[PDB]
Structure formats: structure tokens, C-alpha cells
Design a binder for this molecule. Sequence first.
Ligand SMILES: OC[C@H]1O[C@H](O[C@H]2[C@H](O)[C@@H](O)[C@@H](O[C@H]3[C@H](O)[C@@H](O)[C@@H](O[C@H]4[C@H](O)[C@@H](O)[C@@H](O[C@H]5[C@H](O)[C@@H](O)[C@@H](O)O[C@@H]5CO)O[C@@H]4CO)O[C@@H]3CO)O[C@@H]2CO)[C@H](O)[C@@H](O)[C@@H]1O
Ligand SMILES: OC[C@H]1O[C@H](O[C@H]2[C@H](O)[C@@H](O)[C@@H](O[C@H]3[C@H](O)[C@@H](O)[C@@H](O[C@H]4[C@H](O)[C@@H](O)[C@@H](O)O[C@@H]4CO)O[C@@H]3CO)O[C@@H]2CO)[C@H](O)[C@@H](O)[C@@H]1O
Length: 476
Amino acid sequence: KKLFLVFWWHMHQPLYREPYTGEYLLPWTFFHAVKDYYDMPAYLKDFEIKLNFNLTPVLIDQIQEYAQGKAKDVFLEAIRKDPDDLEKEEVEKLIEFTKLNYEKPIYRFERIRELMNKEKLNREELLDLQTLNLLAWCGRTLRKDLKDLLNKGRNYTQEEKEYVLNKYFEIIKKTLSIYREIKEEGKGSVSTSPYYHPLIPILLNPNCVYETTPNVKIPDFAVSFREDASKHVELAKEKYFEIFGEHPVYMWPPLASVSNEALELYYEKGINMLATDEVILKNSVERASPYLRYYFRELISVFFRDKTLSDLIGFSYHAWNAEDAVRDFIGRLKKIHESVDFQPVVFVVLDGENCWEYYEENGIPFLEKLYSTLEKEEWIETLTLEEAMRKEDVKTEVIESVKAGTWFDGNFLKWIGNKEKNEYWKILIEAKKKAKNDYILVAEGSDWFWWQGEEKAPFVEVFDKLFRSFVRRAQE
Ligand SMILES: OC[C@H]1O[C@H](O[C@H]2[C@H](O)[C@@H](O)[C@@H](O[C@H]3[C@H](O)[C@@H](O)[C@@H](O[C@H]4[C@H](O)[C@@H](O)[C@@H](O[C@H]5[C@H](O)[C@@H](O)[C@@H](O)O[C@@H]5CO)O[C@@H]4CO)O[C@@H]3CO)O[C@@H]2CO)[C@H](O)[C@@H](O)[C@@H]1O
Ligand SMILES: OC[C@H]1O[C@H](O[C@H]2[C@H](O)[C@@H](O)[C@@H](O[C@H]3[C@H](O)[C@@H](O)[C@@H](O[C@H]4[C@H](O)[C@@H](O)[C@@H](O)O[C@@H]4CO)O[C@@H]3CO)O[C@@H]2CO)[C@H](O)[C@@H](O)[C@@H]1O
């Protein structure tokens, strides 16, 4: 009797490229590419297990632009310059960026502490601030090559900074290739999502928000978004075909978000399998075991992630000693294995790039130990998505209806239903009536609604500028 374990690491960034200037207004695609997007699948070169990945098409577009030397990244321009040439505004943004990240373990450099305690920075100090901000985001692969620079800790030169930037762009240039390689080698499946990561259930039927939050107030959706929902899926299929030369048969629904109409759309577009969240299972089905392969209306296969295991990796284990977090994780899998009489399928699904910066050494001790341990367990078999879809010796059940929601409490309240978030939907509704191009699709991405109407925070006003610029461009 085996336990089947399926990791599905989801990778996404919203479009940071302002449409009128072409400038990338935040550097997060660059920093996660150098730190996570190459290195997460690259673990498969060193560990003989299966790991799966989701890449959103909008993320792929941006990785391609950086790899081509085309991305004008305003924050990275401030890192690259000699400090004698830094604008006052650029020094302020470098300091604000450092303060935003200062408590994360990847920023654990004594020199950063000294610099943030200084009243004014000279050129030598600013070079250290620029270079240490770069080095903080070093991925696993380059942490071996750049160990001497990482350990130097201070007194960085412009030449060393440029050397680091050159190595980082080499990683970016190899990033889409490593996803293709591990797919071609059978070491993992690669999925995609509807193109700009929207909330498909809302686009298809905004009234589905009342299924979990009947008392919510939403704007007047006086225009149809149903064709846009189809377009996000169709354009993603085309991007997937451009990258991999096949059409996809599985997709990750953004924010695990499903509804009856969304599941029907995925099936109509040729998707045979997806996963979603355990809370939606509990809201929809009586006997909510997350360890079965479900068939929605006997048409599309659906797995529900184990929320507890997914949340331990995402939120708990960054603060544990790596060996003890791995022992806890394996121990919980053993309890699942002993609790059921069939072979359970355990989906662990979460963002693949956002939790590691809170772990010691960017999660490398934890993941190396976790993967090395899984390599050895006879009663655990890690699976690709294709293998999970086809596995015959697993338990199955039919589901006839789901309650629409997301992986945030099984409802939509982080994206709609308060005054500020509703204002974004009102804007989008009005612009859709006059839309002329696919920037209306960019503006449908979930990220804009997520950041809106929350407690003020550094750089989050950039998301508002991007959203509104895409809305404006969509009508021209
Ligand atoms: O205490 C306040 C607040 O602090 C922290 O929030 C701040 C972060 O610490 C800080 O890092 C910064 O967050 C950045 C983030 O680092 C950056 O990478 C970018 O985030 C991207 C994700 O990287 C990307 O994967 C994608 O995330 C999606 C994800 O794909 C999807 O599955 C799902 O989980 O929703 C996510 C959000 O849509 O996109 C986002 C960008 O949309 O940008 C972030 C904002 O600049 O700034 C944070 C706030 O200032 C804590 O993390 C937070 O819990 C605390 O409340
Ligand atoms: O408090 C600041 C914290 O920042 C870090 O939290 C990160 C996680 O590490 C990332 O993994 C990601 O979290 C995602 C998460 O991956 C995804 O599962 C989803 O989380 C759901 C959650 O499963 C569900 O139980 C419920 O609580 O709703 C959540 C929200 O929809 O979405 C998360 C948010 O994008 O990002 C968060 C914040 O970026 C760090 O781990 C924290 O400990 C740190 O203190």
C-alpha cells in the first residue's frame, strides 16, 4: 500500500510593464526569477523525485522579456548605476526596498544592519547597499558559485556588482529551458493557468459570490465578461502550445477558484484535470475526503489539495529547524497512510516562489532535506500530474455540484465586496463597455483586486498605477 504524493508549485507575477513607457515598475519578476524560478525545477537535477509546476502565461511573457535584454526595470537600473549617479528618488527607493525586506533571513547580513543605522550613505556604503540587495536574492545554483562574494559581506566594487548582474541574467536566460527539460525528462508535469490569472468564476457569473457570502454587496455587472473568461483560457492554451508544442490537458485555476460554470468551461476547452482547495470540498460535498480522485459530473478530474500540509510549508516551516520540519511533514504523511484503507493521493499545492525568503538560506536546507528524505521512502511515491490523472489503483468519487469560492476561506472577499475593491470592479465594468484591445484582459488579473483596499503599504500604490494604466490603454 503506497501513499501518492503530488507537489504542484505555482509560479506567477502580474504584468509589471507599464504600457505607455514600457518600464517595469516593480522588480519582483527579476528577483523571483534569479532566486526561485530557475532553482525550484533545478532541484530535479539533484533529487530523483517528481515535482510539478504551474507557469502563468503572463509570467512567461515577462521572463522572456528579461531574458531577451528588453525589460526596462526601473529598480534594477538604480542597483546597476554607480552610486555617484543615483537620483535622490532612487536612493529613497533603495532604502525603502531594504526596509521592506530587512527582517527576512535572506537579508541576514551584518553590513545591512550597519547601513540602515547610518544617517547618510557615501558611495562605498551605497555600493554595499546595492550589491547586498542583489546578493540577498541569490538562488541555490549561484549560492555555490558566489559563496566568496556572499561571505565577503562588505566593501563591494562596481565591478563585482556587474559580475553578479551578469550571472543573474545567465540564470534568467536558462529559466524557461529548465521547465522544458524536466518535462521532457519525465521528472515533472508543467501546467498553465488562464492567461492573466483572473477569477474565472466571477467573470462567468458574478452572482456566484452569493453562494458563500449571501450578504455581500457587489457592483452592477451591467456587461458580460463570459467571452473574456473563455479568451483567458484559449490564450493560455496557445501560449502553452508556443512553449511546449502540445496543448495542455491540466490547468491550475487561479486562487484554486472554481464554480460549476468554471468547471464546465475548463472541460469545454479540453482540460481533463485540475486541482482546487479542501475548503471548497468541505463546502460542496458531504464526505469531504481530500485523498480521492474526484470526477466533476463524470467529465473533469478534480483533486483537492491537503490544505494543512500546503499551509505548513507556506506558513509554518520557515521558522523550524529544517530537519525537524521534515520529520514533522513525513510523520503527518505516515499518519495519513495509516488512517485510510486505500492508497491516498495527497496534493500539496501552493505558491512556488513566495515562502522561501522567510526560511534560513532561502529554504535550501529544508528542501534539500525534504527531497533527500522522500527519495528514500518506500511507501511514498511522488507523482507527476499525468501519473496522478491516470493512476488506476486509487479511490474515486463523483461530485455533482460545487459551491463557488477560492482557497481564501472558500469565498471571494479578498477580491470583491468592500467599497475599495468594488471600485476596481466598477472601473473594469465601465471600461469593458468601451474596450478595444486585450489590455482589458490584463486588468482582469486577480492581483490588482488583491492589493486594493487594504492597509497602506510600501510600493502597493504601484499596483494601482499599473491597473489603471491597463484600464486606460484598453480603451484606446
Ligand atoms: O505586514 C504587512 C505585510 O507584510 C508582507 O507583505 C509585504 C511583503 O513582505 C513584501 O515582500 C512585499 O510583497 C511583494 C512580494 O514580495 C512580491 O514578490 C510581489 O508579490 C507577487 C508574488 O511574488 C507573485 O507570486 C504573485 O502572488 C500571487 C500568487 O501567484 C497567487 O497564487 C496568490 O497567492 O496571490 C498572490 C497575490 O496576487 O503576485 C504578487 C504580486 O501581486 O509583490 C508584493 C507586493 O509588492 O510587499 C508586501 C506588502 O507591502 C507580508 O507578506 C504580508 O502578509 C503582511 O500583511
Ligand atoms: O505574514 C507575512 C508572511 O509572508 C509569508 O507568507 C506568504 C507565504 O509564505 C506564501 O506561500 C504565500 O502564501 C499564499 C499561499 O501559498 C496560498 O496557499 C494562499 O494561502 C491561503 C491559505 O492556503 C489558506 O489557508 C487561507 O489562509 O488563505 C490564504 C490566502 O488566500 O495564498 C497565500 C497568500 O498569497 O504568500 C504569503 C504572503 O505572501 C510567510 O510565509 C509568513 O509566515 C510571513 O510571516
